[PDB]
RNA sequence: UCUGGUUGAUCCUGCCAGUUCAUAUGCUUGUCUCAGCCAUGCGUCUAAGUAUAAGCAAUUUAUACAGUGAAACUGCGAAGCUCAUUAAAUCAGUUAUCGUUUAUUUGAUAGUUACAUGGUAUAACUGUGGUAAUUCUAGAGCUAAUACAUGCAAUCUCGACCCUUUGGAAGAGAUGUAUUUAUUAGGAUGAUUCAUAAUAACUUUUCGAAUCGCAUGGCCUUGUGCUGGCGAUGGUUCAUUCAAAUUUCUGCCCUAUCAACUUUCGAUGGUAGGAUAGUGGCCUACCAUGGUUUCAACGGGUAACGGAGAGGGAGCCUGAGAAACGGCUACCACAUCCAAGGAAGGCAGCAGGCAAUUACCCAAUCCUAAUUCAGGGAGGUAGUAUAAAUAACGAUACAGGGCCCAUUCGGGUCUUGUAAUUGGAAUGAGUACAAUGUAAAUACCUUAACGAGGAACAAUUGGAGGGCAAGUCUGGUGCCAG
């Protein structure tokens, strides 16, 4: 909930550590009818494969749960993702400042608290 | 500055032993 | 040709078998039959065909590869004693009730 | 039952479909880029209008707003990666300077024509929809595919295609058999 | 909201004409992809409780039976729908049960004729019959239990002799459990009349293996003599666990145009009694007149879906747990069959329309049972707005017109037209061999062979113009006009 996508975009440039990119042809959803997977789709998918490998069996998707996880996840795509890069976060309104803001109790409140941080 | 300020917040939002690692280890000994 | 590679080979004394992830490299062809895969697995691990239980084969998009799961019991009797009834029937080790 | 689902439209009809300038514009655009109907342009115009609405929102915000630098640099990175926005013009006023024919130029059909694999945009389209064009190791049959720079580099004939090294098509081997017979 | 007229030319006010995830209706594609009425139909079996099936099979596995096993007697468990509506009285959190019951799981726990008693017993079963007739039935004759009843030469202390100094040992003594009452003593908690022990009695005085399967060891006193291994099913009490029932405090609507409410067949409290599984006006006999409230009692409204019954009320029965979607009695109605003598039902249902809810399974997640294996309409499986194609690339022949602007006259521009012939390639819908997929199967994915010139493998919808006859009509100033 605190995570908002583009801050990690800056981190990736500012991390100075590589990002484990995948192959160009491996990323089409289905023959071009579904665009390239967004970066998020490649993490949530690998959670499944990493989650499948240990349990030694697949996960079937319930007929009900199928009706809020497949389409909209790929209707956001055709509405948002163009060439596999998400554009939905841009139109959406979020309080970006609060997620970054030092709202934790360890925050500057008096002159001494900020004076400590200089030390 | 703001990028870091986000980083400590996640650290705040987010004897030393992991149950899963102990489960992976027996799987590895099983391996 | 076709290649079979096994990873995460977890040997299970309590069910007395070996479970693993089987990956199949099949250029220029449909896919491999489970009888066929069990054949090659059982020559490789030096076990009877009744003791090898493979399942769950999915071809990744674009073809040419598959990933699934495989079991190789320490004995054939153990294979009957532990395998699901249907997984025994699909090999003919058990008859449909 | 269980929760219903959100879905959205990728295009919107223009304010007035009937300006002669407008019609001549779709005529030029469909002719140059071989578009099937006006729904593709309506889609691209909708998408570009959304990007511009975001960009003007950011131009409105004062420089050094967290929101502004955030949202705009993210826009610039995405528009660069799709290849529309060149490396030397990474600033939001030039985001405000795009034009739809850039997005049509990024359509896989256009590269299949442009790289020399096809002699025409329509030839490119029939090759793509017929599974003769592969983006690296993967066969793609959608002309509306948006090609990235790294994906632009790797456009080729597919291994399974008769033009990529597979066996001659049904017509060729059929005629060869009849000639032999 | 805009656009053009109304002037010789403008401004203003008027007039005229053109300028939808709303509803119906029409054509096409849906070859791929994708998403109040109706007489309308309709339980349970392991090696382990009982076999004399006149059941089955085997033969040495049975001279008491011994495998399997119908029936019957025992044991265990049976605990979705449809209507109404209710403001912290539902529900959520939390406290207490030293105020309670609790199948099952788990840990402990009972030295106080017998080489095994009776029918005080019958089912299944054999046989005789009545009835229009039922999960309707009477007579006669059998036979069993983990069903029903009955029921059976030990140990521990004080210990002289201080004999021997571990030690033996005279003598004295002592010795279930359950209920109720009375009495005495009184490790645990903050706290107890709590726990436990003892005495005197009481009780329609409880219980303290007459059970089963597999194995046949150790001894000798050769008798089938003594002594025995692993389990199952039973049983008293306590604790634990699964739960249940009350109970402490807290918890976002408007409210006084809702100010008193209660004792209205208990309202507040005490004593005693009745009942509960137990506390308690919960109820009963007497006694006091109390209890909430302007710090909002009580009453009213509500987007408080934001608790009730199985034809209708009354009553009973089982079990650890239900006032049972089970059964029984009477009453009130509905309605069926009949030989009109009686019998039986809860369908007064369910599902539909103003019409196919089916077929395949306990595998997967789980569970009930004499339980590995049986079952579960719990559950699972199947049935019935979104991206493509209808085509792409050449060669040749034959002809000079093709297009744009302009009310007007005309002006502007150049590689064109085919309603001509012809060539080799590509592949999709279809026709489909397989494997995979799966409880099995469908579907998905992958994949042999075939598959285009009218590529007849023959998508539509709407609009604007023509032109043609020995053709037809109507009006005219011929050969015209409509």
UniProtKB/Swiss-Prot annotation, chain A:
Residue segments, region Disordered: 63-119
Skewed-composition ranges (Basic and acidic residues): 110-119
Compartments it resides in: Nucleus, Nucleolus
Signal peptide: none
Misc. remarks from the entry: Present with 1430 molecules/cell in log phase SD medium.
Its job: Component of the U3 small nucleolar ribonucleoprotein. Required for the early cleavages at sites A0, A1 and A2 of the pre-ribosomal RNA. Participates in ribosome biogenesis.
Name of protein: U3 small nucleolar ribonucleoprotein protein LCP5
Residues of the full protein shown: 239 to 357 of 357
Swiss-Prot record, chain B:
Subcellular location(s) per record: Nucleus, Nucleolus
Highest taxon listed in the record's lineage: Eukaryota
Misc remark: Present with 5130 molecules/cell in log phase SD medium.
Function text: Involved in nucleolar processing of pre-18S ribosomal RNA. Required for efficient pre-rRNA cleavage at sites A0, A1 and A2, and biosynthesis of 18S rRNA.
Domain writeup: The WD domains are required for nucleolar localization and U3 small nucleolar RNAs binding.
Similarity field: Belongs to the WD repeat RRP9 family.
Quaternary structure and partners: Interacts with UTP25. Component of the ribosomal small subunit (SSU) processome composed of at least 40 protein subunits and snoRNA U3.
Record protein name field: Ribosomal RNA-processing protein 9
Organism: Saccharomyces cerevisiae (strain ATCC 204508 / S288c)
Lineage start: Eukaryota, Fungi, Dikarya, Ascomycota, Saccharomycotina
Gene this chain is encoded by: RRP9
Shown residues in whole-protein numbering: 65 to 121 of 573
Swiss-Prot record, chain C:
Keyword Transcription carried by entry: no
Compartments, record wording: Cytoplasm
GO MF, one example: structural constituent of ribosome
Posttranslational modification: N-terminally acetylated by acetyltransferase NatA. Also partially acetylated by NatC.
Keywords: Acetylation, Cytoplasm, Isopeptide bond, Phosphoprotein, Ribonucleoprotein, Ribosomal protein, Ubl conjugation
Residues with the Phosphoserine modification: 11, 53
Principal subcellular localization: cytoplasm
Glycyl lysine isopeptide (Lys-Gly) (interchain with G-Cter in ubiquitin) cross-link, chain position(s): 18
GO cellular component, as recorded: cytosol; cytosolic small ribosomal subunit; mitochondrion
GO BP annotation list: cytoplasmic translation; maturation of SSU-rRNA from tricistronic rRNA transcript (SSU-rRNA, 5.8S rRNA, LSU-rRNA)
Subunit record text: Component of the small ribosomal subunit (SSU). Mature yeast ribosomes consist of a small (40S) and a large (60S) subunit. The 40S small subunit contains 1 molecule of ribosomal RNA (18S rRNA) and 33 different proteins (encoded by 57 genes). The large 60S subunit contains 3 rRNA molecules (25S, 5.8S and 5S rRNA) and 46 different proteins (encoded by 81 genes).
Miscellaneous remark of the record: There are 2 genes for eS24 in yeast.
Protein name from the UniProt record: Small ribosomal subunit protein eS24A
Species annotation: Saccharomyces cerevisiae (strain ATCC 204508 / S288c) (Baker's yeast)
Full-sequence portion shown in this chain: 4 to 100 of 135
Curated annotation (Swiss-Prot), chain D:
Note: Present with 106000 molecules/cell in log phase SD medium.
Record protein name field: Small ribosomal subunit protein uS4A
Functional note: Component of the ribosome, a large ribonucleoprotein complex responsible for the synthesis of proteins in the cell. The small ribosomal subunit (SSU) binds messenger RNAs (mRNAs) and translates the encoded message by selecting cognate aminoacyl-transfer RNA (tRNA) molecules. The large subunit (LSU) contains the ribosomal catalytic site termed the peptidyl transferase center (PTC), which catalyzes the formation of peptide bonds, thereby polymerizing the amino acids delivered by tRNAs into a polypeptide chain.
Domain spans labelled S4 RNA-binding: 106-180
Subunit structure: Component of the small ribosomal subunit (SSU). Mature yeast ribosomes consist of a small (40S) and a large (60S) subunit. The 40S small subunit contains 1 molecule of ribosomal RNA (18S rRNA) and 33 different proteins (encoded by 57 genes). The large 60S subunit contains 3 rRNA molecules (25S, 5.8S and 5S rRNA) and 46 different proteins (encoded by 81 genes). Interacts with snoRNA U3. uS11 interacts with MPP10. Component of the ribosomal small subunit (SSU) processome composed of at least 40 protein subunits and snoRNA U3.
Main localization (coarse): cytoplasm
PANTHER family noted in UniProt: 30S 40S RIBOSOMAL PROTEIN, 40S RIBOSOMAL PROTEIN S9
Segments of this protein annotated with the region Disordered: 159-181
Top-rank lineage group of the source organism: Eukaryota
Cellular compartments annotated: Cytoplasm; Nucleus, Nucleolus
